[PDB]
Amino acid sequence: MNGPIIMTREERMKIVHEIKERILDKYGDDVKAIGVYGSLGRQTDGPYSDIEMMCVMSTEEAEFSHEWTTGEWKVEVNFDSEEILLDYASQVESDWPLTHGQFFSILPIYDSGGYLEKVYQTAKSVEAQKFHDAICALIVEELFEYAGKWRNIRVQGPTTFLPSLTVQVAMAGAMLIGLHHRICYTTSASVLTEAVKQSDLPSGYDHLCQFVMSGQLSDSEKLLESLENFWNGIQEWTERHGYIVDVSKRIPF
Amino acid sequence: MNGPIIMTREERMKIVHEIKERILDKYGDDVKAIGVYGSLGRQTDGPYSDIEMMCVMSTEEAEFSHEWTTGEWKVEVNFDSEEILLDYASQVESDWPLTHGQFFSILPIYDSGGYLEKVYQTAKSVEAQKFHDAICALIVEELFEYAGKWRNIRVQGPTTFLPSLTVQVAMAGAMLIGLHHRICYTTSASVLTEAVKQSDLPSGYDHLCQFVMSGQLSDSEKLLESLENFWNGIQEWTERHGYIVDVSKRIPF
Ligand SMILES: NC[C@@H]1O[C@H](O[C@H]2[C@@H](O)[C@H](O[C@@H]3[C@@H](O)[C@H](N)C[C@H](N)[C@H]3O[C@H]3O[C@H](CN)[C@@H](OP(=O)(O)OC[C@H]4O[C@@H](n5cnc6c(N)ncnc65)[C@H](O)[C@@H]4O)[C@H](O)[C@H]3N)O[C@@H]2CO)[C@H](N)[C@@H](O)[C@@H]1O
Ligand SMILES: NC[C@@H]1O[C@H](O[C@H]2[C@@H](O)[C@H](O[C@@H]3[C@@H](O)[C@H](N)C[C@H](N)[C@H]3O[C@H]3O[C@H](CN)[C@@H](OP(=O)(O)OC[C@H]4O[C@@H](n5cnc6c(N)ncnc65)[C@H](O)[C@@H]4O)[C@H](O)[C@H]3N)O[C@@H]2CO)[C@H](N)[C@@H](O)[C@@H]1O
Ligand SMILES: [Mg+2]
Ligand SMILES: [Mg+2]
Ligand SMILES: [Mg+2]
């Protein structure tokens, strides 16, 4: 296989509708809705883009997927019950700004009763408290953890991990900003470009992203300085915005 | 919080045993085993390392965690029923080389009767077919996907994502090598260093990793050329080792 080929939107939609009819052929009345990702209200695609689709099933507990290649293109189809999909659309994880923008660009191509619009409405109406909870979790589970990793590199190496770690920290910072502003980034590739455009960034984040976006990640001393500056900015920024991590317990149970 | 502080192994093990005693007081006879994993269960922990612990519970369906910081250090304790943990230890995902080293480096600190040995034996006895399937899935779900992403960047940008994408591709290549050689990498920091030391590397992989490990990721033309060369190396390497991705179906269901 030669990897993904160039295709037009029209050629991709022909493939999409073939899959739609095959889903209806195989699963019949158990299909509530079929949608294609990236096709409502937008084209941020590309000549080499793969195909992703979602299928709402009537079967309780249905949760499976088919992901395959023809050698020329790749497809992913996820099959979920309405309940499982609505639950997922309302959960705010650390990478919500990366993952849940898809729920606003699903093109319904089969829907027997407003199911995909209900998923869209559920994804759009998430409680503000959930973003506060996710931000506090991210600080502990990701950022504090990354700070230990780069401080270990400072004292014991390996500096050969520092470029990869710096990329990971910049992405976690983009999630923090996206959660704060309730922004779902358009694509994986646009995460950093859209993150640094937002107002009220933690101090040092934009400086860190300059290394990651330019690819100038070979000066380990500069990266460690920029990481520490960003970590200090996180402390001031979270304190200022009231994202207060509980530090009062040695053991929280 | 001032970020993670320096601690000695002795200081960390004192905290581990304090947490052990609190787990036994709170959850009582439902606790079957407590272990420490990561580089502390391996006695190679760094000065800034966090603490990761695992608990085996008798409680049916138990699957929860406590993850917190004191402001000075961070702990994650995972609590799983025996059935859930053994099922997880026997599943081989794309990132098995990153996640499942926990099961081969368990330092027992409490065991009511061989529970941690059962976990190790389950992780060690996984059938070769599961690694074959995981490798074929990785090629489709990760590498083929990444090829579309950098080929899109070549024709429409943004090159500002290329350093991050290249890091991701190098990590996916390391997962492929780890699955093939049944290697669980010791730490996330050592993944690329240990990956390029293995025999039977796909052509172009070592060259790509040099960019990522040195942090010289600013030459977009060189990266795109190196990514294509690695993608070709994957095709030759998988055919030679019999990791054949099925391309004979436009729709496989
Ligand atoms: N189906 C509803 C819901 O899904 C839940 O599961 C999640 C997630 O666990 C699961 O990941 C899939 C893997 O399990 C599988 N082994 C391989 C698949 N390829 C995974 O699909 C998801 O993750 C990939 C990431 N490579 C997404 O693809 P891609 O990079 O091309 O992303 C395209 C656009 O989507 C956005 N984006 C970027 N990264 C992600 C991630 N990690 N997740 C979701 N969206 C992402 C970004 O804007 C980019 O431009 C792929 O799209 C995605 N499907 O997949 C689902 C989430 O759909 C649970 N199973 C359950 O709660 C329920 O079924
Ligand atoms: N408990 C058994 C089993 O676990 C399953 O869940 C998975 C996974 O979903 C889960 O991830 C946790 C998140 O859900 C949670 N929001 C935050 C936790 N911190 C996550 O823990 C796991 O992911 C982090 C990654 N930041 C790991 O930390 P770190 O880089 O410091 O890892 C330290 C060293 O350990 C190795 N390692 C192991 N897993 C990983 C991952 N995923 N990424 C990177 N490195 C990893 C590596 O060598 C590194 O140097 C953290 O260790 C990890 N626990 O956690 C578990 C898998 O452990 C299900 N919940 C269920 O099937 C069942 O409970
Ligand atoms: Mg995709
Ligand atoms: Mg962790
Ligand atoms: Mg950790």
Side-chain angles (χ1 to χ4, degrees), chain B residues 189-239:
Chain B
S190 79
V191 170
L192 293 182
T193 59
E194 290 166 355
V196 302
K197 268 82 221 177
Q198 305 310 315
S199 65
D200 252 349
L201 300 184
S203 177
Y205 181 68
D206 185 275
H207 187 250
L208 186 72
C209 284
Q210 290 326 123
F211 294 108
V212 172
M213 291 172 70
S214 70
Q216 297 288 351
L217 295 158
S218 67
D219 193 327
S220 301
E221 189 175 311
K222 277 186 195 168
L223 297 187
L224 291 165
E225 183 184 342
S226 180
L227 287 165
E228 289 294 340
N229 284 342
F230 175 52
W231 184 228
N232 294 334
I234 289 298
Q235 313 298 320
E236 184 272 341
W237 185 90
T238 58
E239 188 169 69

Short mmCIF file of all heavy atoms in Angstrom, two decimals, chain B residues 189-239:
data_model
loop_
_atom_site.label_atom_id
_atom_site.label_comp_id
_atom_site.label_asym_id
_atom_site.label_seq_id
_atom_site.Cartn_x
_atom_site.Cartn_y
_atom_site.Cartn_z
N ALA B 189 10.54 8.50 29.36
CA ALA B 189 11.75 9.19 28.93
C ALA B 189 12.71 8.29 28.17
O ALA B 189 13.53 8.79 27.40
CB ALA B 189 12.48 9.79 30.13
N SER B 190 12.64 6.98 28.38
CA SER B 190 13.58 6.04 27.78
C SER B 190 13.02 5.35 26.54
O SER B 190 13.70 4.48 25.98
CB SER B 190 13.98 4.98 28.81
OG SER B 190 12.97 4.00 28.94
N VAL B 191 11.81 5.71 26.10
CA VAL B 191 11.16 4.99 25.00
C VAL B 191 12.01 5.05 23.74
O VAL B 191 12.36 4.02 23.15
CB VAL B 191 9.76 5.57 24.76
CG1 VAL B 191 9.18 5.00 23.46
CG2 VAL B 191 8.85 5.26 25.94
N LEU B 192 12.36 6.26 23.30
CA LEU B 192 13.09 6.38 22.05
C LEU B 192 14.50 5.86 22.19
O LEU B 192 15.03 5.22 21.28
CB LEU B 192 13.11 7.84 21.58
CG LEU B 192 11.76 8.42 21.17
CD1 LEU B 192 11.94 9.84 20.69
CD2 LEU B 192 11.10 7.56 20.10
N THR B 193 15.13 6.11 23.34
CA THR B 193 16.48 5.61 23.53
C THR B 193 16.51 4.09 23.46
O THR B 193 17.34 3.51 22.77
CB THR B 193 17.07 6.11 24.85
OG1 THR B 193 16.25 5.70 25.96
CG2 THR B 193 17.21 7.62 24.83
N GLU B 194 15.55 3.42 24.09
CA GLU B 194 15.52 1.96 24.03
C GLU B 194 15.04 1.45 22.68
O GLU B 194 15.49 0.38 22.24
CB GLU B 194 14.65 1.40 25.16
CG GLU B 194 15.28 1.58 26.54
CD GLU B 194 14.31 1.36 27.69
OE1 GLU B 194 13.10 1.16 27.44
OE2 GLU B 194 14.75 1.41 28.86
N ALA B 195 14.17 2.20 22.00
CA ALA B 195 13.64 1.73 20.72
C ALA B 195 14.73 1.65 19.66
O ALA B 195 14.82 0.65 18.94
CB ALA B 195 12.51 2.64 20.25
N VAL B 196 15.58 2.68 19.56
CA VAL B 196 16.59 2.66 18.52
C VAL B 196 17.73 1.68 18.81
O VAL B 196 18.56 1.45 17.94
CB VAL B 196 17.15 4.08 18.26
CG1 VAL B 196 16.02 5.03 17.86
CG2 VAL B 196 17.88 4.60 19.48
N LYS B 197 17.80 1.10 20.01
CA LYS B 197 18.80 0.08 20.30
C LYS B 197 18.38 -1.31 19.84
O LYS B 197 19.21 -2.23 19.81
CB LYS B 197 19.14 0.12 21.79
CG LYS B 197 20.30 1.02 22.06
CD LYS B 197 19.92 2.40 22.13
CE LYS B 197 21.01 3.20 21.38
NZ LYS B 197 20.54 4.67 21.41
N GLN B 198 17.12 -1.49 19.47
CA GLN B 198 16.63 -2.81 19.10
C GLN B 198 17.09 -3.22 17.71
O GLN B 198 17.39 -2.39 16.84
CB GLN B 198 15.10 -2.84 19.17
CG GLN B 198 14.56 -2.41 20.52
CD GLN B 198 15.24 -3.14 21.67
OE1 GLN B 198 15.42 -4.36 21.62
NE2 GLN B 198 15.59 -2.40 22.71
N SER B 199 17.15 -4.53 17.50
CA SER B 199 17.43 -5.08 16.19
C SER B 199 16.19 -4.97 15.31
O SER B 199 15.08 -4.70 15.78
CB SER B 199 17.87 -6.54 16.31
OG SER B 199 16.81 -7.35 16.80
N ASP B 200 16.40 -5.14 14.00
CA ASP B 200 15.30 -5.22 13.05
C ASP B 200 14.52 -3.91 12.97
O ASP B 200 13.29 -3.90 12.94
CB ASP B 200 14.34 -6.37 13.39
CG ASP B 200 14.45 -7.53 12.43
OD1 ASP B 200 15.11 -7.38 11.38
OD2 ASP B 200 13.85 -8.58 12.73
N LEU B 201 15.24 -2.79 12.93
CA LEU B 201 14.48 -1.56 12.85
C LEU B 201 13.96 -1.36 11.42
O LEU B 201 14.69 -1.62 10.46
CB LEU B 201 15.34 -0.35 13.24
CG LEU B 201 15.94 -0.32 14.64
CD1 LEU B 201 16.67 1.00 14.88
CD2 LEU B 201 14.86 -0.52 15.68
N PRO B 202 12.73 -0.87 11.27
CA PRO B 202 12.28 -0.47 9.93
C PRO B 202 13.20 0.58 9.36
O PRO B 202 13.69 1.46 10.08
CB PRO B 202 10.87 0.09 10.19
CG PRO B 202 10.44 -0.53 11.49
CD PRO B 202 11.70 -0.69 12.30
N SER B 203 13.46 0.48 8.06
CA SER B 203 14.31 1.46 7.39
C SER B 203 13.76 2.87 7.61
O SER B 203 12.55 3.10 7.55
CB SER B 203 14.41 1.15 5.90
OG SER B 203 15.18 2.13 5.22
N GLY B 204 14.67 3.80 7.89
CA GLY B 204 14.31 5.19 8.10
C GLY B 204 13.89 5.54 9.51
O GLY B 204 13.79 6.74 9.83
N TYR B 205 13.67 4.56 10.38
CA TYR B 205 13.20 4.88 11.73
C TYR B 205 14.28 5.57 12.55
O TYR B 205 14.02 6.57 13.21
CB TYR B 205 12.70 3.63 12.45
CG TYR B 205 12.20 3.96 13.84
CD1 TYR B 205 11.05 4.71 14.01
CD2 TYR B 205 12.89 3.55 14.97
CE1 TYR B 205 10.58 5.04 15.27
CE2 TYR B 205 12.44 3.87 16.24
CZ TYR B 205 11.28 4.60 16.38
OH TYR B 205 10.82 4.93 17.64
N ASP B 206 15.50 5.03 12.51
CA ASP B 206 16.58 5.64 13.29
C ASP B 206 16.86 7.06 12.83
O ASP B 206 17.07 7.96 13.66
CB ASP B 206 17.84 4.78 13.18
CG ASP B 206 18.96 5.28 14.07
OD1 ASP B 206 19.71 6.18 13.63
OD2 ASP B 206 19.09 4.78 15.20
N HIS B 207 16.82 7.30 11.52
CA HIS B 207 17.04 8.64 10.99
C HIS B 207 15.97 9.61 11.49
O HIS B 207 16.28 10.74 11.87
CB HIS B 207 17.05 8.59 9.46
CG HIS B 207 17.42 9.89 8.81
ND1 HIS B 207 16.51 10.66 8.12
CD2 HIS B 207 18.60 10.55 8.74
CE1 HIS B 207 17.12 11.74 7.65
NE2 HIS B 207 18.39 11.70 8.02
N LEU B 208 14.71 9.18 11.49
CA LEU B 208 13.64 10.02 12.01
C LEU B 208 13.83 10.31 13.49
O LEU B 208 13.64 11.45 13.94
CB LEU B 208 12.29 9.36 11.76
CG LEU B 208 11.04 10.18 12.11
CD1 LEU B 208 10.83 11.31 11.12
CD2 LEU B 208 9.83 9.25 12.15
N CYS B 209 14.21 9.30 14.26
CA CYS B 209 14.37 9.50 15.70
C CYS B 209 15.49 10.46 16.03
O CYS B 209 15.45 11.13 17.07
CB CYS B 209 14.64 8.17 16.39
SG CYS B 209 13.18 7.17 16.56
N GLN B 210 16.51 10.55 15.17
CA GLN B 210 17.60 11.49 15.43
C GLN B 210 17.09 12.93 15.47
O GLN B 210 17.51 13.72 16.33
CB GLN B 210 18.70 11.34 14.37
CG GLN B 210 19.51 10.04 14.45
CD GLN B 210 19.70 9.53 15.87
OE1 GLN B 210 19.32 8.40 16.19
NE2 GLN B 210 20.32 10.34 16.73
N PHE B 211 16.17 13.28 14.57
CA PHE B 211 15.56 14.62 14.62
C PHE B 211 14.85 14.84 15.94
O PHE B 211 15.00 15.89 16.58
CB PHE B 211 14.58 14.80 13.46
CG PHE B 211 15.22 14.81 12.10
CD1 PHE B 211 15.05 13.74 11.25
CD2 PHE B 211 15.96 15.90 11.68
CE1 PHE B 211 15.63 13.74 9.99
CE2 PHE B 211 16.54 15.91 10.43
CZ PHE B 211 16.38 14.83 9.58
N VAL B 212 14.06 13.85 16.37
CA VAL B 212 13.23 14.00 17.56
C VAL B 212 14.09 14.02 18.82
O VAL B 212 13.81 14.76 19.77
CB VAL B 212 12.16 12.89 17.60
CG1 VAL B 212 11.43 12.92 18.93
CG2 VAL B 212 11.19 13.06 16.45
N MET B 213 15.12 13.18 18.87
CA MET B 213 15.95 13.11 20.07
C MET B 213 16.89 14.30 20.19
O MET B 213 17.16 14.76 21.31
CB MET B 213 16.73 11.79 20.09
CG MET B 213 15.84 10.57 20.29
SD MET B 213 16.68 8.99 20.08
CE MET B 213 17.72 8.97 21.53
N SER B 214 17.38 14.82 19.07
CA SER B 214 18.23 16.00 19.11
C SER B 214 17.43 17.30 19.20
O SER B 214 18.00 18.34 19.54
CB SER B 214 19.13 16.02 17.87
OG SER B 214 18.38 16.27 16.70
N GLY B 215 16.13 17.25 18.93
CA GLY B 215 15.35 18.47 18.90
C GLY B 215 15.55 19.31 17.67
O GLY B 215 15.09 20.46 17.65
N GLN B 216 16.23 18.79 16.65
CA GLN B 216 16.39 19.50 15.38
C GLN B 216 15.18 19.18 14.51
O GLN B 216 15.20 18.31 13.65
CB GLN B 216 17.70 19.10 14.70
CG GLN B 216 18.95 19.47 15.49
CD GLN B 216 19.23 20.96 15.51
OE1 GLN B 216 18.59 21.74 14.80
NE2 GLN B 216 20.21 21.37 16.32
N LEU B 217 14.10 19.93 14.76
CA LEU B 217 12.83 19.71 14.08
C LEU B 217 12.36 20.93 13.29
O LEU B 217 11.16 21.08 13.04
CB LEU B 217 11.77 19.29 15.10
CG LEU B 217 12.00 17.94 15.78
CD1 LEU B 217 11.25 17.88 17.11
CD2 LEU B 217 11.60 16.77 14.87
N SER B 218 13.27 21.81 12.89
CA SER B 218 12.88 23.05 12.22
C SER B 218 12.96 22.96 10.70
O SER B 218 12.46 23.87 10.02
CB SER B 218 13.75 24.21 12.70
OG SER B 218 15.09 24.04 12.28
N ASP B 219 13.58 21.92 10.15
CA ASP B 219 13.72 21.76 8.70
C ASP B 219 12.56 20.92 8.20
O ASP B 219 12.64 19.69 8.12
CB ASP B 219 15.07 21.13 8.36
CG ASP B 219 15.42 21.23 6.89
OD1 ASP B 219 14.50 21.20 6.04
OD2 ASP B 219 16.62 21.35 6.58
N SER B 220 11.47 21.60 7.82
CA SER B 220 10.23 20.91 7.46
C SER B 220 10.42 20.00 6.25
O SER B 220 9.84 18.91 6.19
CB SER B 220 9.13 21.93 7.18
OG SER B 220 8.90 22.74 8.33
N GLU B 221 11.21 20.44 5.27
CA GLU B 221 11.48 19.62 4.09
C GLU B 221 12.19 18.33 4.48
O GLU B 221 11.84 17.24 3.99
CB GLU B 221 12.31 20.42 3.09
CG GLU B 221 12.48 19.78 1.72
CD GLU B 221 13.21 20.69 0.75
OE1 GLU B 221 12.84 21.88 0.64
OE2 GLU B 221 14.17 20.22 0.10
N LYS B 222 13.17 18.41 5.37
CA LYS B 222 13.88 17.21 5.80
C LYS B 222 12.97 16.28 6.58
O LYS B 222 13.04 15.06 6.43
CB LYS B 222 15.11 17.60 6.63
CG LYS B 222 16.33 17.96 5.81
CD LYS B 222 17.54 18.18 6.71
CE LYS B 222 18.66 18.90 5.97
NZ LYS B 222 19.71 19.39 6.90
N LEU B 223 12.10 16.84 7.44
CA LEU B 223 11.19 16.00 8.21
C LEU B 223 10.22 15.25 7.30
O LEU B 223 10.02 14.04 7.44
CB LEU B 223 10.42 16.86 9.22
CG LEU B 223 11.28 17.54 10.29
CD1 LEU B 223 10.41 18.23 11.35
CD2 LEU B 223 12.22 16.53 10.95
N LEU B 224 9.61 15.97 6.35
CA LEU B 224 8.66 15.32 5.44
C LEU B 224 9.33 14.24 4.62
O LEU B 224 8.74 13.17 4.39
CB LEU B 224 8.01 16.36 4.53
CG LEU B 224 7.07 17.35 5.20
CD1 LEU B 224 6.80 18.52 4.27
CD2 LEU B 224 5.76 16.67 5.61
N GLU B 225 10.55 14.49 4.15
CA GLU B 225 11.29 13.45 3.44
C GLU B 225 11.58 12.26 4.34
O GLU B 225 11.48 11.10 3.92
CB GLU B 225 12.58 14.04 2.87
CG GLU B 225 13.41 13.07 2.05
CD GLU B 225 14.72 13.67 1.59
OE1 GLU B 225 14.85 14.91 1.62
OE2 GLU B 225 15.63 12.90 1.21
N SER B 226 11.95 12.53 5.60
CA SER B 226 12.26 11.45 6.53
C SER B 226 11.01 10.66 6.89
O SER B 226 11.06 9.43 7.06
CB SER B 226 12.91 12.01 7.79
OG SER B 226 13.21 10.98 8.71
N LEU B 227 9.87 11.34 7.00
CA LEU B 227 8.62 10.65 7.30
C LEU B 227 8.22 9.72 6.17
O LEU B 227 7.78 8.59 6.42
CB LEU B 227 7.52 11.67 7.58
CG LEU B 227 7.61 12.40 8.93
CD1 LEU B 227 6.71 13.63 8.96
CD2 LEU B 227 7.26 11.45 10.06
N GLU B 228 8.36 10.17 4.92
CA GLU B 228 8.05 9.30 3.79
C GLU B 228 8.99 8.10 3.75
O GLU B 228 8.56 6.97 3.48
CB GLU B 228 8.13 10.08 2.48
CG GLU B 228 7.01 11.08 2.26
CD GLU B 228 5.65 10.43 2.09
OE1 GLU B 228 5.59 9.22 1.77
OE2 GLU B 228 4.64 11.13 2.28
N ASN B 229 10.27 8.32 4.02
CA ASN B 229 11.22 7.21 4.03
C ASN B 229 10.88 6.20 5.12
O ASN B 229 10.96 4.99 4.90
CB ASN B 229 12.64 7.74 4.22
CG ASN B 229 13.19 8.35 2.95
OD1 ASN B 229 12.68 8.10 1.86
ND2 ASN B 229 14.25 9.15 3.08
N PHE B 230 10.48 6.69 6.30
CA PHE B 230 10.06 5.78 7.36
C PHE B 230 8.80 5.02 6.95
O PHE B 230 8.69 3.82 7.21
CB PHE B 230 9.81 6.57 8.65
CG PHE B 230 9.25 5.73 9.75
CD1 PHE B 230 9.85 4.54 10.12
CD2 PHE B 230 8.10 6.13 10.42
CE1 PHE B 230 9.33 3.77 11.14
CE2 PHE B 230 7.57 5.36 11.44
CZ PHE B 230 8.18 4.18 11.80
N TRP B 231 7.86 5.72 6.31
CA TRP B 231 6.63 5.06 5.86
C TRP B 231 6.94 3.95 4.86
O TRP B 231 6.33 2.87 4.92
CB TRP B 231 5.69 6.11 5.25
CG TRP B 231 4.32 5.62 4.81
CD1 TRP B 231 3.72 5.88 3.61
CD2 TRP B 231 3.38 4.85 5.57
NE1 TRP B 231 2.48 5.30 3.56
CE2 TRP B 231 2.24 4.66 4.75
CE3 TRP B 231 3.38 4.29 6.85
CZ2 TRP B 231 1.12 3.94 5.17
CZ3 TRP B 231 2.27 3.57 7.27
CH2 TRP B 231 1.16 3.40 6.43
N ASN B 232 7.88 4.18 3.95
CA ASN B 232 8.33 3.11 3.06
C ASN B 232 8.99 1.98 3.83
O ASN B 232 8.75 0.80 3.55
CB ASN B 232 9.30 3.66 2.01
CG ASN B 232 8.64 4.64 1.06
OD1 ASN B 232 7.43 4.59 0.83
ND2 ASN B 232 9.43 5.55 0.51
N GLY B 233 9.84 2.33 4.80
CA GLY B 233 10.47 1.31 5.62
C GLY B 233 9.47 0.45 6.36
O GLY B 233 9.68 -0.76 6.51
N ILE B 234 8.36 1.04 6.81
CA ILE B 234 7.30 0.28 7.46
C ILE B 234 6.73 -0.76 6.50
O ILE B 234 6.50 -1.92 6.88
CB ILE B 234 6.20 1.23 7.97
CG1 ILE B 234 6.72 2.02 9.16
CG2 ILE B 234 4.94 0.45 8.33
CD1 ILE B 234 7.08 1.14 10.32
N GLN B 235 6.48 -0.37 5.25
CA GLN B 235 5.90 -1.30 4.28
C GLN B 235 6.80 -2.50 4.05
O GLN B 235 6.33 -3.65 4.02
CB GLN B 235 5.63 -0.58 2.96
CG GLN B 235 4.93 0.75 3.11
CD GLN B 235 3.56 0.62 3.74
OE1 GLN B 235 2.81 -0.31 3.43
NE2 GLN B 235 3.23 1.54 4.63
N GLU B 236 8.11 -2.27 3.88
CA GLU B 236 9.04 -3.38 3.67
C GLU B 236 9.15 -4.24 4.92
O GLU B 236 9.24 -5.47 4.83
CB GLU B 236 10.41 -2.85 3.28
CG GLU B 236 11.44 -3.93 2.94
CD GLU B 236 12.23 -4.43 4.15
OE1 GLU B 236 12.27 -3.73 5.18
OE2 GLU B 236 12.82 -5.53 4.07
N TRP B 237 9.16 -3.60 6.09
CA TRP B 237 9.38 -4.31 7.35
C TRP B 237 8.18 -5.19 7.70
O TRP B 237 8.35 -6.34 8.11
CB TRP B 237 9.66 -3.28 8.45
CG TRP B 237 10.03 -3.82 9.78
CD1 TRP B 237 11.29 -4.11 10.24
CD2 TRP B 237 9.14 -4.10 10.87
NE1 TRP B 237 11.23 -4.57 11.53
CE2 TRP B 237 9.92 -4.57 11.94
CE3 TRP B 237 7.75 -4.01 11.03
CZ2 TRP B 237 9.36 -4.95 13.16
CZ3 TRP B 237 7.20 -4.38 12.25
CH2 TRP B 237 8.00 -4.84 13.30
N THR B 238 6.96 -4.68 7.51
CA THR B 238 5.78 -5.47 7.85
C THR B 238 5.61 -6.64 6.89
O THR B 238 5.25 -7.74 7.31
CB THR B 238 4.53 -4.59 7.86
OG1 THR B 238 4.37 -3.97 6.58
CG2 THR B 238 4.66 -3.52 8.93
N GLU B 239 5.87 -6.42 5.60
CA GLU B 239 5.79 -7.54 4.67
C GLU B 239 6.80 -8.62 5.03
O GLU B 239 6.48 -9.81 5.02
CB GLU B 239 6.00 -7.06 3.23
CG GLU B 239 5.75 -8.13 2.19
CD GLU B 239 5.71 -7.59 0.78
OE1 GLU B 239 6.76 -7.16 0.27
OE2 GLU B 239 4.61 -7.59 0.17
#
